[PDB]
Structure formats: structure tokens, C-alpha cells
Write a protein that binds this ligand. Sequence first.
Ligand SMILES: [Zn+2]
Length: 184
Amino acid sequence: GWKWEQIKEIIESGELARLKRSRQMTDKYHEHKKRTAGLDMNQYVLQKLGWSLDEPQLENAAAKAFSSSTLYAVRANDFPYNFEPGVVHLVLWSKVALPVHSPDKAVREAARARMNAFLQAQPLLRPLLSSGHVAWFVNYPELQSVARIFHAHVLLFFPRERYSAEQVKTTVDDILSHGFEPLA
Ligand SMILES: [Zn+2]
């Protein structure tokens, strides 16, 4: 799998298609694809996250992305990409889209700045941020699924010489249980 420095270089160059699953994980992803071939996965995800129109509305319509914990959700990626041991592949879903690949440089930079501020503000990521061991990307339209719901790939690096696999499990379970904290 990709080493952390390679991951950072790929994200920086925008060559996101290079971030691929292993042959085997590609096989499993293929079988899950067979299973969901009869579904609109946008509606499925909305349903699972509690964001369907059926649900109540703790909204103000104009709420800023990440301004309230009801507006986002972090999950472990069930079919992670092929990264070196210690890299944890999470998915951050947001009810509010962030136009991070807009042709408008002002809009794109502003949307990226918001995502960055959100992740930087997270106490549960503090030592990883201090280490440069948090990265994120949003797959382009020609690469993504579930295009009606914003989601970012959030990668956390726990080097093997710094965290046992069991300590990684513990910390990630902690993050997913607590969730991320909102940002005004
Ligand atoms: Zn949640």
C-alpha cells in the first residue's frame, strides 16, 4: 500500500485516481456492488444517517457546514483503499456540501479552508495533526459514488512504531463513538 508521504504527494498533485483499493479489497467491493446494484445509494445513505425528509428538522436551512453535530457523520470506510499499515480510512459525510473542486478558485479555496478548520479544531486528532498525520480528499465526479451527499475521505496515520494495532483500534473506536465536535 501507499506510504504516508506518497499519499500526501498524490493528494497534493490531485492525482486522486491513483488512490486505489488492493486487488482483494477490489474483489470485496465488487461483491458489495453486486448487492447494492438495485438501490439508489444516495437515498440509502440518507436513510442510514437519519437525514431523509421523513425525519424531523433540527435545521435552520442556512446552517454552516459542521456548525452542528447533526449536520455531519464520521464512519469507518468498509472498503478502505490500499494504504500502508497504520493508515486508517474514514469517511466524513456532510449534509451541507462543500464545493472543494469548484472552477472558481475563490470558492474552491474557501471550501477547502472550511474543511481544514473543521479537522484542525478536533481535540481527538490533536497529536496526529501535530505530526502531519491527518489528510483528506474528496473524490472528483468521475470517481465518486453517492454524488448527492458530500463525503470526504479522512485519513489518519498511526505509525506502527508509535501505536500498537490495538491502540489504533481503541483510538478510532473512541473517535467514531464520540464523533467530531462542531465548529461555529
Ligand atoms: Zn453521528
